[PDB]
Design a protein around this ligand. Structure first.
Ligand SMILES: Nc1ncnc2c1ncn2[C@@H]1O[C@H](COP(=O)(O)OP(=O)(O)OP(=O)(O)O)[C@@H](O)[C@H]1O
Ligand SMILES: Nc1ncnc2c1ncn2[C@@H]1O[C@H](COP(=O)(O)OP(=O)(O)OP(=O)(O)O)[C@@H](O)[C@H]1O
Ligand SMILES: Nc1ncnc2c1ncn2[C@@H]1O[C@H](COP(=O)(O)OP(=O)(O)OP(=O)(O)O)[C@@H](O)[C@H]1O
Ligand SMILES: Nc1ncnc2c1ncn2[C@@H]1O[C@H](COP(=O)(O)OP(=O)(O)OP(=O)(O)O)[C@@H](O)[C@H]1O
Ligand SMILES: [Mg+2]
Ligand SMILES: [Mg+2]
Lengths: 731, 721
């Protein structure tokens, strides 16, 4: 007689029937063969095996079977893991998975209040949960949880969630279940709401999260619950040519990278050659000590050395370079003409003495060109350098092809579209290059010593430091007007609540968020949305459909922000904005109304333009298509606006990934490296008409299929059609 | 046939005018004017400029400087001085001739007009016109002694002319050496009571112009100007904390741009520290800093190998390590982070480094067993010791800090402790990190307000005594109190760039007095370096310097008030240089000085002293080249060498063989001599060791370092070869 070791030490006679039951529950409703997995378990059986070992084998074997031809094995693997998690957490919190009548209850509604209370008192959960909810509130919300929504998770979804999202105790054990996580996130985001409305909003937030219609960013997904509510995704720093500010921004970069991430740094003001790259080296070393973008204008004298940072004694391998390019450079490139490099220091002096200093970088477009033409002659030989446009352009694309960097920032279109151009301008984007928000450096005052006490007090006037508060819409489940009309206003509300509940580590961050209340709404499952609507990627139908879809998203994004303004008040800096003059996405309402008719949406854009002029909007910025990374893997969605990499592939920590309904739509899905990205860019240009910020546009090129002069044509077309950024260039 | 003059023009060559220039320059000096006259005949060419002729006489005279004919240096110096006088006279629009037609290099009448004009151009500071009347300037202008320019060697005046004499916007020298000294004295006299000011300006001018003392390089080139940067060095203490680490990185960058002499202690930082070392290095390059680490720190192996590139490593060594090295025993490396937690939870955290000596050993023995395997690392003492001396022999670094003797001798041990020294390793002053508070945003305005509680950040305010001219009790009794007063005035007139610097200087009022011409002082007193007579003479001399240093600080306390943190110090309990007055009184009798040490101990207990620290033998560098002195307490490198800057010891011809060069000396004597001096020095000494690869081996080099520790030295500096 063969034996098996159980959780409670002990020893029990092998029962083949109990393994059959576990497999049957896990395969229920799913297009798989339970007999196949039963056979594999017979082969994997060994006398004295632990019940824990048996469960780990069924999970792994099921995950090994995931394919483009049988994708449902992922759901079988996920459930087998879920059934193991339920048992672990039940034993840790001291309840049973059986009720009075002996039915299976993975979730314990009675335990919810006791559980959260205990781990609030251990410093794992934040105090604001007990302060803003009564025992009856907890009990009411515990009974609202829908345990059947755990059946929405792919194996990689729950595996990623289990590995670094589900909260753990001091000894590193998982304590909360997926639906408990979602409810606690909803409860955290509902705190800023009026006490008589709080439970009503917590239920709506829980619904839209648990049903996988929207997701909040990774920071919010793992911190909204905890004492330290770090909910911010990225920061954008502006550095003045000044020992004090340079070392101040180096400090912020170090503080940011320890606690948060997504750092972007503009060094275009810094003096030309110590120079600028010692400052780049200085930021690099703080990065290593504890994922940051550094931006430089393409006319900066040190640009040649800056492009070579990631590829002779002056390199930096922990930073991501980016290049701010004006229209004039692109105009020069057409006729293969020459390009004059300049030093900001001598450029600043000249302009400042020709009129609170003003450099060249403090102008864009029509004005910038006037100053540049005058500066490229009337400056002395020591503050200039002559180079060929095509020679520079060619070397950039060569580095881009080998390293993937640098990222591009088309500063002229970015600035003339900035709807808050009345409060300043924008010198760079963030790391992922979706953000376009007004920015400026902090100003310092001389410190003061009190000899009696020994305390020193220094003061600084806060500058505009864009924080990004991010979420995304699952286009798999939200693509109709009815679905968009419900969901977008709810996501706008959640992200405005994120700003109120965020723990601010940098004071300038708090100052900027309170004045602007900027948010970034993106999308996932874009490619799946096209395929199930029978739309080919490389077609006129793609461009026409993208136009129609992103019009709806923009309309109900503004509608949502308007309602918050009526209810909470407009953002402080609304008066003077493009919004306040009835200019939406840098276009007249007559232009939009004509676009609305061609799209077959026929939305009331004029009536909305009038209500925004009267009541304002709650948020200074709204839409930015960010790279969606871990949040789409949890949703089982295709990433952002990217075309899929493959119909099936893996990763390592095994994370097998298939697009939604890949078996049903096999050939309707076309992989990234097989697509002519002239279409990708035309499609992005159509979307850009309804996006106030930018898009993290990747380009996927095959060395065999693409050459030097064709790669140039893509980048040139991006500029021509009015894109503000380009992100990674993969191969 | 013809020569071009300053005023364009053309004049018939006159061989007599070159003879006169050479005669004035050789007057009273042991040289051959005919030799230099012959060389000038060879160097003559038709259409040569008078300027070119003068540059040739200067260079030729400098080329003749040797150990057998040193007076050529004075001939070269004077020929340069006569050129400087002409240049400055033409720039300020006066003549070198008076009413009767006598030679007047200095224009007493022009002094007020000159300084007034260049104050109004932003070259000289406003405090000069604010604290002195036209009659004051005129009185001090008439006190100047132009004959004191005859005290300069060629390298002395050449260094002074190149780096120190103030220049206008077009880069031309405007002030003469004696004008520089008077303007320095006038700047240091500003803090004095208006009815006493001129009296102190004349005394400061006298002691500077007569080359009896010098102030540090910063004071020598800035005391005169609007930006009075008079500080020589700073010592930073860094807490294991993002905010403080980046705060100290900012200070290091601010300090190195404007000042220098930086020292940084990183012994508190968490074990894998070198990313922080790399971070300090990059700020240094962006715009000469020491970094110190305890020898028990887990990252010490990687830290020793940093220089095998813009930083100078140093190692804090406790007694226990040296005790282990005797029996060739093992040495347990530790991480401060886990060491701090253990000690802190066993009772504002308290780490291992926050203890010394008797207490430190108790904690270390307990930490070396009861800690887990991940927070430890076992290594052999002799294996580590040997690798340190190997790097020291190849690179010259690391410098050494014997922290136990340093801390038990700290006379201000009641306000904290000392983790490291400065760059040059003469400084031993109480130090601590600044403590940070959470910033505050006013949403209505844009303004953020940050608070931090200032920590003890030692600034060093430095000068030195010329032992060539000040070695008797009568000379020391006059000069030392005057130098103490000048350095206390330096603290009042210093422009503070870092607020913690201002806070520390005002609380402690620490000063550092060193020496130059030590080797010359021994030789002219007929004392052999490698002898018992050296040890006996050093004892006697440094007793006198210490006694009249304390006397000087006492007088200032009676007059200006004791330093804020006096009460609780070793000074206030009558413990001088970590010894009882009965011990000192016995030492005073053996030295044949018989000084009233008990009476002084009592007066210090009653009235206090003005300065928290007094004595530190710093490397004397540029200031001794100006004085023509042998550097600090070092034995001379050579009887003659170049840097063209030809350098000879004083009276090298007269004392040729009595002078013994550095690489020929058994430095067992150097260390014994330093140990005797250390009994009368409250801080430390920048002790260099000069070893010949052929004459010394591995085990003998170890014996020197071991003996330094045994005899109670607090630091060792460069190891040259
Ligand atoms: N006697 C058995 N023979 C075969 N498989 C078994 C046996 N007992 C448990 N298993 C299997 O072990 C896996 C893990 O189940 P489970 O986590 O409930 O372990 P357990 O040891 O039965 O724990 P507990 O007694 O706490 O419920 C399941 O797939 C189950 O079918
Ligand atoms: N109704 C159900 N639906 C899905 N999974 C279930 C259900 N009932 C139990 N499970 C899961 O099946 C596994 C076995 O649980 P169960 O308590 O039945 O243990 P067993 O090993 O089958 O029996 P026993 O513990 O009595 O020896 C666990 O992972 C559990 O979460
Ligand atoms: N006619 C001359 N023949 C030879 N040497 C001369 C003659 N005139 C000047 N010198 C030499 O030139 C050197 C520099 O002299 P000085 O600085 O006085 O220059 P200068 O041209 O005479 O200027 P000034 O006339 O303004 O005094 C001296 O060594 C001096 O002997
Ligand atoms: N009494 C003196 N003692 C020392 N140096 C002197 C003396 N008189 C002049 N000199 C210096 O010697 C040089 C002589 O310059 P000065 O103009 O006096 O005469 P010169 O150049 O020989 O001839 P001339 O007067 O025709 O120009 C100058 O460098 C001057 O500073
Ligand atoms: Mg069981
Ligand atoms: Mg002349």
């Amino acid at each position: 007689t063969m034996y098996v070791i159980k959780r409670s030490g002990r020893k029990e006679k092998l029962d083949i029937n109990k393994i059959r039951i576990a497999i049957k529950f896990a395969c229920e409703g799913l297009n798989v063969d339970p007999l196949e997995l039963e056979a594999d378990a017979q082969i994997q059986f060994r006398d004295g095996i632990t019940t824990k070992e048996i469960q780990q084998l069924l999970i792994k074997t099921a995950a090994e079977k995931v394919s483009a031809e049988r994708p449902d094995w992922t759901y079988t693997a996920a459930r087998l893991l879920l059934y193991d998690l339920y048992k672990d957490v039940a034993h840790l919190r001291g309840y049973s998975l059986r009720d009075d009548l002996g039915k299976y209850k993975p979730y314990n509604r009675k335990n919810f209040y006791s559980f959260v209370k205990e781990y609030v008192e251990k410093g794992i959960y934040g105090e604001y949960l007990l302060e803003n909810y009564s025992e009856e509130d907890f009990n009411k919300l515990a009974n609202y949880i829908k345990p059947e929504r755990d059946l929405y998770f792919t194996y990689t979804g729950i595996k990623i969630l289990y590995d670094r999202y589900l909260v753990r105790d001091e000894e590193g054990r998982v304590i909360e279940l997926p639906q408990e996580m979602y409810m606690l996130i909803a409860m955290t985001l509902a705190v800023p709401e009026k006490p008589e409305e709080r439970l009503k909003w917590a239920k709506k937030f829980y619904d839209v999260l648990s049903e996988h219609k929207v997701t909040v960013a990774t920071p919010t997904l793992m911190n909204a619950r905890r004492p330290f509510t770090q909910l911010s995704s990225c920061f954008v720093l502006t550095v003045d040519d000044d020992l004090f500010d340079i070392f101040d921004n180096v400090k912020k970069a170090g503080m940011i990278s320890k606690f948060a991430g997504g750092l972007g740094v503009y060094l275009g003001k810094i003096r030309a050659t110590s120079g600028v790259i010692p400052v780049v080296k200085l930021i690099n070393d703080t990065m290593t000590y504890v994922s940051a973008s550094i931006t430089l204008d393409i006319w900066h004298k040190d640009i040649l050395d800056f492009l070579e940072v990631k590829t002779e004694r002056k390199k930096a391998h922990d930073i991501h370079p980016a290049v701010s390019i004006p229209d004039l450079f692109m105009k020069r490139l057409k006729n293969r003409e020459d390009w004059t490099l300049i030093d900001p220091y001598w450029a600043r002096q000249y302009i400042t003495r020709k009129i609170e200093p003003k450099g060249l970088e403090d102008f864009y477009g029509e004005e910038f060109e006037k100053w540049y033409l005058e500066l490229e002659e009337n400056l002395p030989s020591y503050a200039k350098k002559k180079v060929n446009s095509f020679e520079l352009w060619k070397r950039l694309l060569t580095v881009a092809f080998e390293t993937g960097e640098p990222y591009i920032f088309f500063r002229d279109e970015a600035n003339r579209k900035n709807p808050n151009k009345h409060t300043g301008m924008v010198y760079s984007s963030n790391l992922c290059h979706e953000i376009v928000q007004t920015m400026s450096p902090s100003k310092h005052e001389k410190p003061v010593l009190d000899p009696e006490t020994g305390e020193i007090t220094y003061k600084k006037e806060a500058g505009d430091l864009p924080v990004c508060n991010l979420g995304s819409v699952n286009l798999g489940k939200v693509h109709t007007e009815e679905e968009i009309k419900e969901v977008l206003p709810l996501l706008v509300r959640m992200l405005d609540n994120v700003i109120e509940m965020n723990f601010y580590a940098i004071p300038e961050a708090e100052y900027t968020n309170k004045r602007y209340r900027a948010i970034g709404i993106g999308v996932s499952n874009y490619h799946y949305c096209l395929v199930k609507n029978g739309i080919k990627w490389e077609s006129e139908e793609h461009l026409k459909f993208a136009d129609k879809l992103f019009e709806l998203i923009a309309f109900y994004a503004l509608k949502g922000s308007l309602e918050l303004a009526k209810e909470r008040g407009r953002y402080k800096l609304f008066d003077g904005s493009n919004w306040s003059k009835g200019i939406l996405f840098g276009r007249s309402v007559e232009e939009i109304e004509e676009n609305s008719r061609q799209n077959g949406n026929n939305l009331p854009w004029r009536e909305l333009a009038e209500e925004i002029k009267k009541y304002g909007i709650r948020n200074a910025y709204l839409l930015a298509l960010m790279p969606t990374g871990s949040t789409s893997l949890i949703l089982g969605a295709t990433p952002s606006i990217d075309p899929i990499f493959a119909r099936f592939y893996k990763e390592e920590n095994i994370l097998p990934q298939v697009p939604p309904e890949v078996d049903r739509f096999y050939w309707h899905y076309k992989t990234a490296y097989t697509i002519d990205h002239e279409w990708t860019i035309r499609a992005a240009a159509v979307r850009q008409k309804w996006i106030d910020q930018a898009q993290s546009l990747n380009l996927f090129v095959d060395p065999q299929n693409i050459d030097g002069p064709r790669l140039s044509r893509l980048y040139e077309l991006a500029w021509e059609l009015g894109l503000k950024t380009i992100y990674y260039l993969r191969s």
